[PDB]
């Protein structure tokens, strides 16, 4: 598998050609042979924000001891040479009637970090339900009370600390919630440097072995860019080869369609080169 420098030569060479973009367009969005059954059942159709963004049966997230369906997928990115696995749950922006299941996932797995890569609305249309209350209010979702204890806006994202109370048992759990608001659907981040800083910030907030919950509107486009970038950061820092196409394929084997547009792939490939060359010593 060659080396970081070699893979980086090939990537910059291939961006010039550009074979890297041709090979992206050739890649399947949906892995052939992977069953998608539960997502299309009558009771589940309106639990999908988009008709064509559905979880595979093999990687779909199940609620513990609870039959309710949710459009969410486990996505794990391995870096074998580093004995490292970065775990994610990739999901859509909740609908009004899916907030209960979203918070159940957070509770089940005591997830401490949610990364939301969308605004609530775009162009007068709702892209994600507001599944948390404006402080100081308290919301009930499916027998979870949710309150926002802290809310602070930076340039490009909002940082919120949320308290989740299980009303059945009286137990509570705290979650950090990062909402990246400067990144429109089917496009690239408004500022590349804000994006790279945000990814590295997310990396720093990981808790050992705990998946990061990541969502956008569909949970594949902007989410796929973020996952690709975190993977690449880990690889560059360890002097290991980076093949973006292998990374996208690996995500797509776990949730169809990750990285929605060619423009997004080109963005992430360029950002990978940028980070490599910024960090390069000699």
């Amino acid at each position: 598998a060659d080396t970081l420098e070699g893979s980086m030569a090939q990537l910059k060479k291939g961006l010039e050609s550009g074979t890297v973009l041709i090979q992206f367009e050739q890649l399947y969005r949906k892995k052939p042979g992977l069953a998608i059954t539960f997502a299309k059942l009558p009771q589940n159709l309106d639990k999908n924000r988009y008709k064509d963004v559905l979880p595979y049966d093999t990687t779909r997230v199940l609620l513990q001891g609870n039959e309710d369906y949710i459009n969410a997928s486990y996505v794990n990115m391995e870096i074998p040479a580093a004995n490292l696995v970065n775990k994610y749950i990739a999901t859509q922006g909740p609908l009004p009637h899916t907030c209960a299941q979203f918070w159940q996932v957070v509770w089940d797995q005591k997830l401490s970090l949610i990364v939301m890569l969308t605004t609530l609305t775009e162009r007068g249309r709702t892209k994600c339900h507001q599944y948390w209350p404006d402080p100081p209010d308290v919301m009930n979702h499916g027998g979870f009370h949710i309150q926002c204890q802290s809310e602070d806006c930076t340039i490009a994202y909002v940082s919120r600390e949320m308290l989740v109370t299980n009303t059945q048992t009286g137990e509570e759990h705290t979650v950090t919630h990062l909402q990246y608001v400067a990144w429109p659907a089917f496009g690239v981040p408004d500022d590349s440097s804000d994006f790279l800083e945000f990814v590295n910030y997310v990396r720093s907030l990981r808790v050992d072995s705990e998946p990061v919950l990541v969502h956008s509107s569909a949970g594949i486009g902007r989410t796929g860019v973020l996952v690709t970038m975190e993977t690449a950061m880990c690889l560059t820092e360890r002097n290991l080869p980076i093949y973006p196409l292998d990374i996208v394929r690996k995500m797509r084997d776990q949730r169809a369609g990750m990285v929605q547009t060619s423009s997004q792939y080109k963005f992430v490939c360029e950002a990978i080169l940028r980070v490599y060359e910024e960090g390069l010593v000699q």
Binding site: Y50, K51, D52, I220, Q260, T261
Partner: peptide, 8 residues
């Protein structure tokens, strides 16, 4: 039910 848009 709608597909995930890639345009306006």
């Amino acid at each position: 039910f709608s597909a995930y848009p890639s345009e306006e």
